């Protein structure tokens, strides 16, 4: 599955601008961005709802696509087992009892599998919708906010179950969910979307994690410390709004504190910690609004 | 070829499970029985003779209006519930979707025609008189097929363009019931009444609705060609728009 | 504002069992629990919506109550400005242009305050619901999932603006929400709900005694550092061989590093060990399913 | 103090700001004009005399079933959007809510009575005949009040108990239309027909609906007592249930 030179526009307004994308040796990829930047447009392009996108999409006809979009789609009047039966027959090659039973047992909807969907709640409907997505037997399964109105325990359990499904079936996953701290638990690579193009592509495989040191101080002092650290060491990232300065992992604090003491200016908060996706997200996208 | 048979199969099951279908059959049977009883208990005939044109026309109109509501409901179900985006993945799916929906429309039409045939048989069996001919029931089935196919394709096109439902129901009711109401006052239009009356024999809406009341399906050659051409043009346009429209 | 001995039963199923609650010297409080534990029941009893308390509720007539529950409630066919006027006449004392204008200008829905609700998206409507809650001029604000449709950057501006109104006037807030790391940003205390009672209560300014900050300094400076710490705070364990002293958690490092820089001291290492809401949540809540 | 006035004030504004109120008036006026013109163009009277009793009864019947539908919609709006939770907060608000809804019902009834008065006044003004009496319009106003108050409070109890909106519309149509259809057939019941026919003169639903199509308003003392008592019991029960129900 490859994308080449996609540029989608709505009249004078431009929504997607010359992106490239490829699943390179990775199983779980996260897509992160704001609201109305073209996250749903990109997802609709990926799923197949838009044909007049003016580019080239490399997909195979023998390969099926199972998807989850903005809201669960179900027959509200009828029952859940009817929904599973209908989408397994209509979309898959047929109905497999053992396969569907295994999916039902792992996700846990059996106590409430025989009651009508209109009597369900939001988390139950979302889990059932995820089951509808796996009903297709996909090679690529893409989910748009699978954990919207569900509690932390439920979300951790659901993502772990999805991870356990990734080895019995040959799966490549794209998740465009918010709440990035649940994403760092299960993700192999993250992509950040700003102004349509894919600006940065962070890939994480092993736990080296590129340890860093965080120094926090107010803006009127942040300029001078920034000058000192650019004149002395080599810097990876800076955050102006929070006064967050993110240098690499430093073992000895002696030379920084003696120099800042002889400088008479002082920092508010200092630590060394494992990196996450939150620093990168704020660094890329706090720039358009604040 | 699994998607085409599965879509038609599930609409029939949805029809056979709902109680409104058997409520419509009871209502229709009650109205025909009341009309038959009124005609049989009249004081002019001591022999209980019944003519079958009135029952034919009345049962045809009621059953037609029920079948029309059933086809529009089946057509707009997915658009009402928003599940349509699962059916809009590939191109082969968009075409199998339209073909299967048309096939479902055909199945609904044949079933409703069969029900009308059976119901008329039991009314004729109950009463006494002169039985009809097989060509009449067959030609009634063809008229049912043509009417339902034309209107189903038109409403399918409107629901593709608008993706809503209250307008579709109101629009279907508007085309069926406004024209018989509107036709008498057309003559009162200054110097264009004759022109509109002659031109109404070529407008598909006008003569299909006029011929809805009629007990015979006599068609001219021009009428047959234009109706078939309209069906083919609507099908081709629907296929093209479903394969070129972006949601 | 007190709740005393509240018990609720549905037939034989007991949802709440002798729960007490009190707003003590706190402005922002957090409610944390699972899905379907009876959180919405706690907000509804507190909202005055439930009538069969089987307990006691003390409410002064002069105090106003403002609330937001599960989904925003507005008139869809009518405009947003209309919603503000209608809810001003029905719940408040009246309408004032300056006050409503102040709510409208700070949140940011001015370009689109005059369009019909049928055209809004999910995140804008949540903000409009929040605006109605502040429109009431309440003495207590009770919000049930206020951030279920906005991006992280959108969420931080919304919570910071909420905090700003907390400071400009006098309000007590009850917030129930998942994705607990944003709650810890602005909150004074959190209460955890399990089996119908508040099992654990955490005050964030004061901390817990298990919390430690470990500072290691050189052997020659150890005496002076110990003298300063003995003057200022409590010392539990001291290790000369290790060189490490652990003291109680402090959010600000300013005074401590000022004093050591004044005494010509540069620590070998500094770090803090703190417990977040994720650690407390998992410790209380893993007994549920695992 | 604000609680009573704001809800009632906005229903009148929504009435004056909706397009359906004028669509309904145009439809009703067209129906009344067609009926009057057809009855006036009859060849029995060469002097164009018109009897206003038939126009009175027909206009009153149409306005009653329309004011009833406007009342059910008005009372189910909040339950339809689910915004009733914002109103269901304190006991004082819960009672001002019920009181405000009743006052809104009174003003809508008064407004529909005024429209009826206007329609009858224009029809009498255009044609030639014998004018009516002021006592007829005042009795018509009172009849509007009792019918609309009774059905609105009852249907309000139903909407509070059920929190479903389609069922209320069905129950409203059922209560207006079941009795005239059932009334010719009730008599045929063996050895209980006289008892049920006399007891239909005691059931409030039954005699209010029987008297809906009458051209003159008269009541017995027992009927007045039962109606006022029924209004009071429904109001008291509504207050108790609204102050004791939990959402």
UniProtKB/TrEMBL annotation, chains A, C:
Gene3D superfamilies, A to Z: P-loop containing nucleotide triphosphate hydrolases
Keywords, sorted A to Z: ATP-binding, Nucleotide-binding, Transport
PANTHER family: ABC TRANSPORTER, ATP-BINDING PROTEIN
Keyword Cell cycle applies: no
Signal peptide bounds: none
Sample GO molecular function, one term: ATP hydrolysis activity
Protein name (database record): ABC transporter, ATP-binding protein, putative
Entry similarity comment: Belongs to the ABC transporter superfamily.
One Pfam short name: ABC_tran
Protein's organism: Staphylococcus aureus (strain NCTC 8325 / PS 47)
Record carries keyword Transport: yes
SUPFAM superfamilies in the record: P-loop containing nucleoside triphosphate hydrolases
Positions of the ABC transporter domain: 1-220
From TrEMBL, chains B, D:
GO cellular component: plasma membrane
Top-level taxon in the UniProt lineage: Bacteria
One GO molecular-function entry: ABC-type transporter activity
Pfam family, one: ABC2_membrane_2
NCBIfam families: PSM_export_PmtD
Protein name: Phenol-soluble modulin export ABC transporter permease subunit PmtD
């Amino acid at each position: 599955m490859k994308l080449e030179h996609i540029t989608k526009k709505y009249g004078s307004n431009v929504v997607l601008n010359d992106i490239d994308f490829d699943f390179g040796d990775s199983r779980i990829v996260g897509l992160i961005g704001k609201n109305g930047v073209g996250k749903t447009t990109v997802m609709k392009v990926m799923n197949g709802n838009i044909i007049k996108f003016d580019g080239k999409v490399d997909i195979d006809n023998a390969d099926n696509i199972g998807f989850l979009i903005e809201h669960p789609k179900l027959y509200d009047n009828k029952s859940g087992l009817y929904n599973l039966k209908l989408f397994a027959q209509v979309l898959g090659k047929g109905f497999d009892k053992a396969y569907t039973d295994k999916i039902i047992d792992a996700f846990g909807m059996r106590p409430y599998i025989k009651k009508k969907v209109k009597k369900y709640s939001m988390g139950m409907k979302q889990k059932l919708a995820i089951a509808v997505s796996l009903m297709n037997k996909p090679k690529f399964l893409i989910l748009d906010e699978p954990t919207n109105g569900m509690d932390p325990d439920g979300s951790i359990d659901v993502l772990t179950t999805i991870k356990s499904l990734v080895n019995e079936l040959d799966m490549r996953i794209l998740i465009s969910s918010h709440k990035l701290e649940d994403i760092e638990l299960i993700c192999d690579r993250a992509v950040f979307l700003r102004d349509g193009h894919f600006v940065q592509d962070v890939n994480m495989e092993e736990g080296v994690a590129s340890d860093t040191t965080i120094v926090t101080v107010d803006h009127k002092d942040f300029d001078r410390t920034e000058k000192y650290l650019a004149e002395h060491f080599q810097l990876q990232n800076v955050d102006k709004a929070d006064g967050h300065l993110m240098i690499n992992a430093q073992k000895n604090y002696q030379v920084i504190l003696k120099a800042l003491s002889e400088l008479d200016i002082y920092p508010k908060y200092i630590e060394t910690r494992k990196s996450s996706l939150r620093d990168t997200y704020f660094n890329i996208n706090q720039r358009g609004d604040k | 070829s699994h998607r085409i048979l599965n879509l038609v199969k599930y609409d029939l099951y949805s029809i056979f499970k709902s109680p409104l279908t058997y409520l419509a059959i009871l209502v229709v049977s009650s109205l025909i029985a009341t009309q038959s009883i009124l005609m049989a208990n009249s004081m002019d005939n001591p022999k209980h003779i019944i003519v079958y044109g009135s029952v034919f026309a009345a049962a045809k109109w009621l059953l037609l209006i029920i079948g029309l509501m059933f086809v529009v409901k089946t057509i707009t179900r997915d658009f009402s519930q928003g599940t349509i985006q699962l059916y809009m993945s590939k191109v082969k799916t968009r075409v199998g979707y339209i073909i299967s929906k048309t096939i479902s429309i055909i199945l609904i039409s044949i079933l409703f025609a069969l029900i009308h045939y059976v119901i008329l048989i039991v009314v004729q069996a109950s009463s006494n008189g002169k039985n009809l001919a097989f060509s009449k029931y067959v030609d009634n089935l063809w008229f049912f097929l043509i009417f339902l196919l034309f209107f189903g394709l038109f409403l399918f096109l409107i629901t593709l363009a608008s993706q809503k439902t209250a307008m579709i129901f109101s629009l279907g009711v508007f085309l069926v019931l406004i024209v018989p109401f509107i036709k008498p006052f057309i003559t009162f239009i200054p110097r264009y009444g004759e022109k509109v009356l002659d031109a109404f024999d070529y407008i598909p809406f006008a003569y299909l609705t006029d011929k809805m009341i009629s007990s015979n399906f006599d068609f001219s050659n021009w009428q047959w060609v234009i109706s078939l051409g309209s069906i083919v043009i609507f099908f081709i346009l629907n296929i093209l728009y479903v394969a070129k429209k972006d949601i």
